[PDB]
Design goal:
The complex is a heterodimer of chains A (300) and B (237).
Chain A: E1 2-5, E2 13-17, E3 20-24, E4 32-36, E5 42-48, E6 56-60, E7 66-72, E8 77-83, H1 86-98, E9 103-104, H2 113-118, H3 123-129, E10 138-141, H4 147-151, H5 177-182, H6 185-197, H7 200-217, H8 220-234, H9 241-257, H10 263-266, H11 269-278, H12 286-295
Parallel strand pairs in A: 4-9
Antiparallel strand pairs in A: 1-4, 2-3, 2-5, 5-6, 6-10, 7-8
Helix pairs in contact in A: 7-8, 7-9, 8-11, 9-12
Chain B: E1 17-21, E2 27-32, E3 38-43, E4 45-50, E5 56-62, H1 73-91, E6 100-103, H2 109-115, E7 123-125, H3 140-148, E8 153-158, H4 169-185, H5 187-195, H6 213-235
Parallel strand pairs in B: 1-6, 6-7
Antiparallel strand pairs in B: 1-4, 2-3, 4-5, 5-8
Helix pairs in contact in B: 1-2, 4-5, 4-6, 5-6
The chains are: A alpha+beta (300), B alpha/beta (237).
The structure holds 4-(thiophene-2-sulfonyl)morpholine.
Residues 56-58, 156-158 of chain B line the site of 4-(thiophene-2-sulfonyl)morpholine (VF3).
Protein name (chain A): A1 cistron-splicing factor AAR2
Function (chain A): Component of the U5 snRNP complex that is required for spliceosome assembly and for pre-mRNA splicing. Involved in splicing pre-mRNA of the A1 cistron and other genes that are important for cell growth.
Family (chain A): Belongs to the AAR2 family.
Chain lengths: 300, 237
Amino acid sequence: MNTVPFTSAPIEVTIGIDQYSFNVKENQPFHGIKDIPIGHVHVIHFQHADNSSMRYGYWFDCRMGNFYIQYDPKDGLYKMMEERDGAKFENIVHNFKERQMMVSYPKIDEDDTWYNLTEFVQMDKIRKIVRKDENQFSYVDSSMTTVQENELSDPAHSLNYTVINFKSREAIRPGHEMEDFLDKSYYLNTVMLQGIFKNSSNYFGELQFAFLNAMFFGNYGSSLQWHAMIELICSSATVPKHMLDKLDEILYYQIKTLPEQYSDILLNERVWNICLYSSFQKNSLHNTEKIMENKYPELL
Amino acid sequence: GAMNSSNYAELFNNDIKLFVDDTNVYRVTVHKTFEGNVATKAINGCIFTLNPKTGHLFLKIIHTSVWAGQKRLSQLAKWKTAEEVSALVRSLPKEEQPKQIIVTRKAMLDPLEVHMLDFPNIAIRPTELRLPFSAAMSIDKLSDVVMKATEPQMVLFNIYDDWLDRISSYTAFSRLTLLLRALKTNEESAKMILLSDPTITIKSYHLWPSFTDEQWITIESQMRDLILTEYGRKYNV
Ligand SMILES: O=S(=O)(c1cccs1)N1CCOCC1
């Protein structure tokens, strides 16, 4: 189990850690989060009490370094930093733990939610979508645009998701215009899987990361990417059986975790109705269709 | 974006543009089978691609052999239309290629956009106008070449005959749409109006009769009366 200490908490803020959150008062004696499960990526996220504008946060993996949070009064945000002095870090954590100034990552033993949401998400792949090579952790916020959003404006602050565009030469073979537009299997299997992602695990990792950024930061471009990657599979007549079964599991846990009151903004009616009721895969997503129909029957 | 009554003079500016109408591409007769089921029999169709400024009509005849062994023909017809329009554009010299293609039915937008990805600077647009181009097969010389075709064939026509020697393209398009709307509303009466007088003939190289300017005014009035007459018959007015 690993720890992310905080130097202090000078401004009132709601702090998230993965799917959990808690409120810290201004100048409250909060000094971090302990008992963070090793083996997964994590996200630690912030929404200031006095300005809910800009949710922001950091994706990290405690296996890659010792990380802590410290507020910067000039830039006005909680910043993640890496501590390279291993003995200093251990001594800091131990004192804060002895004084009981940390919250414990509140994982229920039966609960696989976080694993199920991050099964295919790897830090190395996050760091290629979010480009800032001098840090081992990656900053994301509510306002960051995607490479695709920018083509239709600062490049260094962009989410470099893989561009998916159904009416593009990449998606449509000359001479197979009708075939490739109505059945996206070529674009899914040859262009995206064999060509760009190399395997379905990397494709699912990016889909899962897009969902999590949409949910935790309200990042609109990430929501667009998440739906595009779902639509691309559902709109393909030829998908390996193992991918369809895994997609059903991925989406089931995403829909299960979504705040019920954020459905209006995080779910695209057209894509979901098309995917569940019209597409080639309308009958392949049994678990996802059941949870969607019981939890969000209005959207459908 | 969409082409409507606000931007109507745009049709007659100097930017090359084409209307594409697909309403006569896939044509069938519905009939009973020996067992009392229902089947369709295709008949030859056509793509109606028209430059409204010059009267240039590229009539691509769609021979029934195109449909042999194919499924979902009403869907295929849209993609075949787009394939043929794309092939026409590529066949034209660069300085003759359109800058815009206006489709008369919104279901043609995605098929044509996809076929024209190689031409990102040609705008593909819908229209809010209700144009009567389906009635093109009521023009006898057009129907004749479509029905006689034994293989795929492109036939070229100036749909305005020689009218542009005497009138503007705005007025020629208005005359064309009035004639086609009349033929669509009551084909028999419209043809009677156009051919009732044996002394006015259709030149070998023309589609419509050789009316003088004053005769065209009479004809145009008779077509408006027909359209209004049929409107009253339809709605009991
Ligand atoms: O010039 S045209 O009016 C023309 C129409 C379409 C493309 S070029 N013309 C060419 C000869 O055949 C008769 C019609």
